[model samples]
Target: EKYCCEEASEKKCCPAGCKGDCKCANCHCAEQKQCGDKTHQHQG
Candidate 1:
């Protein structure tokens, strides 16, 4: 089991430029640390 924390590391981290629908944890690029959908959708 892997413990995903707020900060990212080289071995375990998110990918850069990962938009919605993309899995943050276990991403390709762990440098930028682009995990999860940072963007939020506005609802009316």
Candidate 2:
């Protein structure tokens, strides 16, 4: 899970897009991102 942000829990729940368990899952893609206005830049 190279692209998966292991530090996902460190961040807050994505107000733009929240998936699964808000803590472990949020916006995880920049290319496919469409979080309202800004594209999600999740951790590596």
Candidate 3:
């Protein structure tokens, strides 16, 4: 059962610059599973 933009025309909304929620740089939905992997960490 999906959440985020739960509308369901087959579940794949949350686009249009996804400023509502869902977490995906631009928009990918699926609640971002657990967010992307690792990359930029060293913050001085």
Candidate 4:
């Protein structure tokens, strides 16, 4: 189990400009580190 940025080194970080319906954790990005999707919704 690795992060999006981990598996996809070229992929952007969770805190960065995230797009699509795919959740940060689902996309492999860090859940807590994620800014939007779960708790942080509608973006900041």
RMSD of each: 10.2, 7.9, 10.1, 9.3
Candidate 3 lDDT (Cα, 0 to 1)? 0.37
Q: Give me the displacement of residue 42 in model 4, in angstroms.
A: 17
Specify the poorest-scoring 10-residue window by lDDT in model 1.
10-19
lDDT of each: 0.37, 0.40, 0.37, 0.41
What would the TM-score be for candidate 4 when compared with the true structure?
Answer: 0.21
Query: What residue runs in model 2 are displaced by over 4 Å at the alpha carbon?
Result: 1-3, 8-19, 24-36
* Shift in Å, residue 41, candidate 1: 23
* Model 1 lDDT at residue 20: 38
TM-score of each: 0.19, 0.19, 0.21, 0.21
Give the per-residue lDDT digits (tens) of candidate 3, residues 1-44: 33333342232454443433545432243443433347333121
Model 4, position 31: C-alpha lDDT score? 31
15 Cα displacement, candidate 3 (Å): 3.1
Taking the tens digit of each residue's C-alpha lDDT, what string does model 1 give over 1-44? Answer: 13243444323343323333334544432434443466433111
**17, model 4: CA deviation in Å?**
11
Clashing pairs in 4: 4-28
lDDT of 4 by residue, 1-44 (tens): 23344433435443343444334553443333445446643323
